[PDB]
Structure 1
Amino acid sequence: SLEEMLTQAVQEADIEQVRQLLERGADANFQEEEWGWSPLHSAVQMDSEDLVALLLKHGADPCLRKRNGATPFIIAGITGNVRLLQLLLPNVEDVNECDVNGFTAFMEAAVYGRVEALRFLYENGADVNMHRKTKQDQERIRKGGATALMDAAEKGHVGVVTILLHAMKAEVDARDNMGRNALVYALLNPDDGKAKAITRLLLDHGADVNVRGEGSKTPLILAVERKNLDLVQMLLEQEQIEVNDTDREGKTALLLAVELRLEEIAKLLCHRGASTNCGDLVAIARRNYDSDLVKFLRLHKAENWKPQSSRWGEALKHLHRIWRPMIGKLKIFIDEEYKIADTAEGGIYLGLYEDQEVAVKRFSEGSTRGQQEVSCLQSSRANDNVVTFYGSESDGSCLHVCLALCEYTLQEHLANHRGDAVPNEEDESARNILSSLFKAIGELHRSGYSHQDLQPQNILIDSKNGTFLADFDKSIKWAEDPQKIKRDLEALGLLVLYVVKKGDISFETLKNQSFEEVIQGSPDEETRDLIHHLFHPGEDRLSSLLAHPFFWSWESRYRTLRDVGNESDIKTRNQNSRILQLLQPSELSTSFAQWTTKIDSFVMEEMNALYQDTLGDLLKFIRNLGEHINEQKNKKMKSIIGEPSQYFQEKFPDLVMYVYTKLQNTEYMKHFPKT
């Protein structure tokens, strides 16, 4: 706290407290570990001649570097005080000492427009044509290498540029590692006046005008985008300028002028020999409502992008063909032709995000619902079962949310494929859809968000039969109300029935039913138990419910009953054994009590070649039946049973649930199929 009380004194500019602590034994070279600012650094920055002299009296190193490698001498280039530079010069080895990015004290006078500081460094040996030497990470991407002339032109300091070109013999056509001269840096100053002045100074000295800057843009191209006829006139005064130069996207200087509705600039470019066959300029000027420019062009007289979606395919071809203004990276047109669905605000339309097909949800930029949607999506990019979030683009008044384009809604999807499966077939599709919903909602909870509006319209299907969660305009962070999760689990239960019933029961119908009514509507015991656990849960239950026998295939259910019936203690009917102790409950009346009286009598006799009405002997009955069903002597028996998995679940619907319940958290859990 002795060194730390001296850094507080320098900021308060109490000169006496500094003298009191420098004689008390405070470190003058003490660098704070965060950014490395020494007391000598902080004094020069705030321009206090007294504190810089007082600390230099106590041996404060003027070569002491900060985190970015800048000495207090270099900082004096920023401050611009000439007598601070005088105080530090006799203790500096090289005046061209640069920080880790290559910034010398000379450059810091140019960047900040410190003329009196710039001149002092000039006569004292500072290099005017010094390129910045930075680290090898920046060098490998052609960064750095700029001079003081470029720095001064970028900042628009007309005073500094004039002195460098005349008094200090600066190279006007010097290049950085990117290949850019000071002319490019000049046209980037938003002030129209300052840019005009520096351009004149640079052109008269011989700066190359056919150079490339940001986006392969020439100075002529930058002048058009700035909408400054004066800057264009100065450039076209050179005859060697290449007017037919193309930028990254292949747009020429003339093309951008017509696009931006600049009558005189477009006229000037044509009169200087710019080619008019680089685009349909007349139609562009026609849609701009520039009658004068349309006529002027009259007197001087391939497609390949293929969309991936099938439903929206032909519509995407049109949206790519037509011209639209870009909202950042998004190409969108608000029309009934490109509408996807209606929402509580703005609706959903087709769009193109970096030439990628996306579905666009629109919000008023002030809407809290828009914020809740974009907040939840950014956290669920790692969620595989949530629609892929591209980004958000603002037009100033409309919040555009671009999402992965899907073919049909879950409600629509179940309808379109309703006629595929015979009515008495294992519904594999229902398990694939519901499981992916468990994964989406489960991982969404671990991400701290709850959907709050789970309905089949909010569940989409892509072209590859994948199911995704979407429409988080009503989502919340469930930390604020921990028990609000129950709504998603309740809606998940209704979705289990909605999907099992292949969509025949409407979701509105399911919302108006009570819990007991919904349970009755389930066709089997596996669905009834699953929905119960969703309405009556106990943080990661949704992952644990993926092992529920609902998601077991009929072979896996058949395989599991076989494997239990192969237990040694069931086959020997060891009443003392653990396995029968678990299967011996208390409970109500099961459908497999006196199970011998409900099976075909022909099968009963051949298998007895001592079955009791216990559960253990039923599974033993399944084990012997399963291993031997295909033997020659059982061909007649095989016709009675048919497919055995369907047979036992048909005669005893509660069998799978009953075995699962008793063996859930036991050693015999190992007989369950792997999940």
Structure 2
Amino acid sequence: AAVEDNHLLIKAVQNEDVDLVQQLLEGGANVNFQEEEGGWTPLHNAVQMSREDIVELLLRHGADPVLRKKNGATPFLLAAIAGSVKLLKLFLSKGADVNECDFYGFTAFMEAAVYGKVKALKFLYKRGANVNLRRKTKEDQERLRKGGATALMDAAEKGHVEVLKILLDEMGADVNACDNMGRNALIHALLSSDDSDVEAITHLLLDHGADVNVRGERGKTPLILAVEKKHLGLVQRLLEQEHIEINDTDSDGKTALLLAVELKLKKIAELLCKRGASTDCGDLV
């Protein structure tokens, strides 16, 4: 009976039924009940839905403002995902630390970057967020070379151009930080799954001196990734960089040129061939 009312409390929050939430709480429901799959509380749900009135109701009934769910996220971190400056401010007044993180290393600032929440990003910055923190994760994950990413890498990966610009021009983000795998923001940008913003992002990173001689998982370089995405403009800008190594091979033994030929990218292939050792570059495809 007690357990079903606790589940009803969570659903009432999710359905934004204030009167029912009040009734269940006054009836003795556990304001800090955690559901079994993810450890979510009433308060986590209220923050996720950006409902400041429900948040305040739960806090007045004794909700623990810093109680974490199973991934280690606090209400404060969920407020960053929601982009709610008012809730970020509230949890900072109740014991949150601006640089706190979940169990995979995500801070509020990183989450604002991931979710493109510019107002929250700016608020957090002015509250002392460390812009260049690298994700500290679980020992088992760190041993698999996971972890170490920054908010800039998240902005690059998710294609949030305005966030990226703010990070680089206003907040002192380090363009050439690398995660535990050796990937920088440039690699993460070229790995992204949305073809919408990759060109703009890559150009911005290169403007700020992003290092082109870096490797992702299976030996992939920025140049190889750009060839795989068939983007002539990006290959052109990458080749304008001074220290770029055109002859690097990925784990399959392929260079950018060999891949360009296989994908039948005539202009890219000729460009790459001309930069290399070969004398016969116009007739490859």
* Map of 1:354 onto structure 2: none
**SS of residue paired to 2:40:** coil
* Map of 2:83 onto structure 1: 80
Q: Quote the offset at 1:81 in angstroms.
A: 1.9
Q: Which has the higher contact order (CA 8 A, sep 6+)?
A: 2
CA deviations on 1:147-196 (whole Å, 9 max, x unpaired) are: 00111111111111111001110000001111110000111224444111
* Map of 1:159 onto structure 2: 162
Is residue 133 from structure 1 mapped to residue 136 from structure 2 by the alignment? yes
* More strand per residue: 1
* Map of 1:107 onto structure 2: 110
| Structure 2 counterpart of 1:174, one-letter code | A
Q: Quote the offset at 1:23 in angstroms.
A: 2.5
In 1, Cα distance between the equivalents of 2:212 and 2:176? 9
In 1, Cα distance between the equivalents of 2:277 and 2:103? 46
On the 8 A contact 2:81/2:117 being kept in 1, the answer is yes
Q: Quote the offset at 1:26 in angstroms.
A: 2.1
On the 8 A contact 2:76/2:96 being kept in 1, the answer is no
Q: Quote the offset at 1:118 in angstroms.
A: 0.9
In 1, Cα distance between the equivalents of 2:46 and 2:278? 60
In 2, Cα distance between the equivalents of 1:44 and 1:117? 14
In 1, Cα distance between the equivalents of 2:239 and 2:222? 10
Q: Give 2:46's match in structure 1, choosing from 34, 43, 47.
A: 43
On the 8 A contact 2:269/2:284 being kept in 1, the answer is no
Gaps of 5+ in 2: none
Runs of 4+ more than 6 Å apart: none
On the 8 A contact 1:53/1:87 being kept in 2, the answer is no
* Map of 2:283 onto structure 1: 296
On the 8 A contact 2:249/2:255 being kept in 1, the answer is yes
In 2, Cα distance between the equivalents of 1:55 and 1:194? 40
In 1, Cα distance between the equivalents of 2:95 and 2:216? 36
**SS of residue paired to 1:216:** coil
Q: Quote the offset at 1:297 in angstroms.
A: 5.0
In 2, Cα distance between the equivalents of 1:253 and 1:263? 13
* Map of 1:240 onto structure 2: 243
* Map of 1:95 onto structure 2: 98
Q: Give 2:212's match in structure 1, choosing from 188, 209, 219.
A: 209
CA deviations on 1:355-402 (whole Å, 9 max, x unpaired) are: xxxxxxxxxxxxxxxxxxxxxxxxxxxxxxxxxxxxxxxxxxxxxxxx
In 2, Cα distance between the equivalents of 1:212 and 1:204? 20
| Structure 2 counterpart of 1:200, one-letter code | H
Gaps of 5+ in 1: 283-292, 299-675
Q: Structure 1 residues 20, 268: CA separation in 2 closer, same or farther (over 3 Å shift)? A: same
On the 8 A contact 1:101/1:133 being kept in 2, the answer is yes
| Structure 2 counterpart of 1:151, one-letter code | D
CA deviations on 1:409-441 (whole Å, 9 max, x unpaired) are: xxxxxxxxxxxxxxxxxxxxxxxxxxxxxxxxx
In 2, Cα distance between the equivalents of 1:225 and 1:168? 32
**SS of residue paired to 2:247:** coil
Q: Structure 1 residues 190, 143: CA separation in 2 closer, same or farther (over 3 Å shift)? A: closer
In 1, Cα distance between the equivalents of 2:116 and 2:7? 34
In 1, Cα distance between the equivalents of 2:218 and 2:267? 25
Is residue 274 from structure 1 mapped to residue 261 from structure 2 by the alignment? no
In 1, Cα distance between the equivalents of 2:51 and 2:104? 26
Question: How do 1:259-338 residues align onto structure 2 when only pairs under 5 Å count?
Answer: 259-271=262-274, 273-276=275-278, 296-297=283-284
In 2, Cα distance between the equivalents of 1:193 and 1:40? 35
**SS of residue paired to 1:187:** helix
On the 8 A contact 1:9/1:18 being kept in 2, the answer is yes
CA deviations on 1:597-640 (whole Å, 9 max, x unpaired) are: xxxxxxxxxxxxxxxxxxxxxxxxxxxxxxxxxxxxxxxxxxxx
* Map of 1:56 onto structure 2: 59
Task: Report the aligned-residue RMSD.
Answer: 1.8
| Structure 2 counterpart of 1:235, one-letter code | L
In 1, Cα distance between the equivalents of 2:96 and 2:162? 29
In 1, Cα distance between the equivalents of 2:237 and 2:195? 13
Is residue 176 from structure 1 mapped to residue 200 from structure 2 by the alignment? no
On the 8 A contact 2:135/2:150 being kept in 1, the answer is yes
Q: Quote the offset at 1:111 in angstroms.
A: 0.8
On the 8 A contact 1:192/1:228 being kept in 2, the answer is no
Q: Quote the offset at 1:37 in angstroms.
A: 0.4
**SS of residue paired to 1:42:** helix
Q: Give 2:25's match in structure 1, choosing from 13, 22, 42.
A: 22
In 2, Cα distance between the equivalents of 1:222 and 1:212? 10
Q: Give 2:231's match in structure 1, choosing from 228, 233, 243.
A: 228
| Structure 2 counterpart of 1:197, one-letter code | A
After TM superposition, the score normalised by the length of structure 1 is 0.41
On the 8 A contact 1:30/1:39 being kept in 2, the answer is yes
Larger Rg: 1
Q: Quote the offset at 1:24 in angstroms.
A: 2.5
Q: Structure 1 residues 248, 130: CA separation in 2 closer, same or farther (over 3 Å shift)? A: same
In 1, Cα distance between the equivalents of 2:277 and 2:195? 28
In 2, Cα distance between the equivalents of 1:25 and 1:125? 39
Question: Identity of aligned pairs, percent?
Answer: 67
**SS of residue paired to 2:226:** helix
Bigger mean CA deviation after superposition, 203-212 or 76-85: 76-85
On the 8 A contact 2:224/2:255 being kept in 1, the answer is yes
On the 8 A contact 2:181/2:217 being kept in 1, the answer is no
Q: Structure 1 residues 266, 55: CA separation in 2 closer, same or farther (over 3 Å shift)? A: same
